[PDB]
Design a protein around this ligand. Sequence first.
Ligand SMILES: [Cu+2]
Ligand SMILES: [Cu+2]
Lengths: 157, 158
Amino acid sequence: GEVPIGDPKELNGMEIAAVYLQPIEMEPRGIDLAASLADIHLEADIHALKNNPNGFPEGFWMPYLTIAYELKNTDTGAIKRGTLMPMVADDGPHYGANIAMEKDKKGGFGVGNYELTFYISNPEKQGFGRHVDEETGVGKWFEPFKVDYKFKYTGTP
Amino acid sequence: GEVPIGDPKELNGMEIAAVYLQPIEMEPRGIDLAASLADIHLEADIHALKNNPNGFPEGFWMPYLTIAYELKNTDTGAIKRGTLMPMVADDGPHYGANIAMEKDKKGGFGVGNYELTFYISNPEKQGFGRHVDEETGVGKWFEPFKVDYKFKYTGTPK
Ligand SMILES: [Cu+2]
Ligand SMILES: [Cu+2]
């Protein structure tokens, strides 16, 4: 039961898609917003394309990324920011966050039209290395980038 | 190319293999022992088995693991320890380190008989999360564990 967000993008060797579903319970506790405080779980699905230039096998999950988001209700003008955290669910690893929409104390994050932006930086920021020898080496990582989606939020699932 | 260390182990929903190669030039610089100062590149290859209890599809690389190693020359008694760091090569991600063997004059790390031990802790130690709700959740992570290999080190591959 995942709601697609906008259209997926292909860039920097990766497919980058967004979905939301109902709030989830994550361990370790005290990091992700508690399920009962949230209205959605937002996920970024990020996997390697064919011929990924940093050596990741097609379809592999892209690990050690730093991902921030911005969510804007274009009807009300309300904007929030946060980060997506790496975690695993029954359908495998992803980057996600529980997010208050209707339940956000500030208001303005209810049913309506939204723009979602991911701000993504490469794994080296988190100490992940790459071979650069002639035999087994791989190319440079992408510079930090953003991807943008548009979607209708129809209410908490 | 790659020299296999011992046999791969299937444990805790993962296949856990060890290999060594020639020393590898890594980026970013300083993230590991310089290739020129090393004799081997030690790698741990760790992927999900079928029916992985923590949600990982078969074949996927297991990320965010903490992998400490101990390498012991059982002939000489020489021991060294370190950690294998996550990185990617043209055939995919793994955990690795450049290691001085003959070049290490602080111990007897020459050609001979070795025991290699990996001490492996689960992704939660590095902040990686898991769903635990009924609908989308996965099983509990393994407690820290060790795997042991024996091999003959014959010098840098060439
Ligand atoms: Cu999640
Ligand atoms: Cu390596």
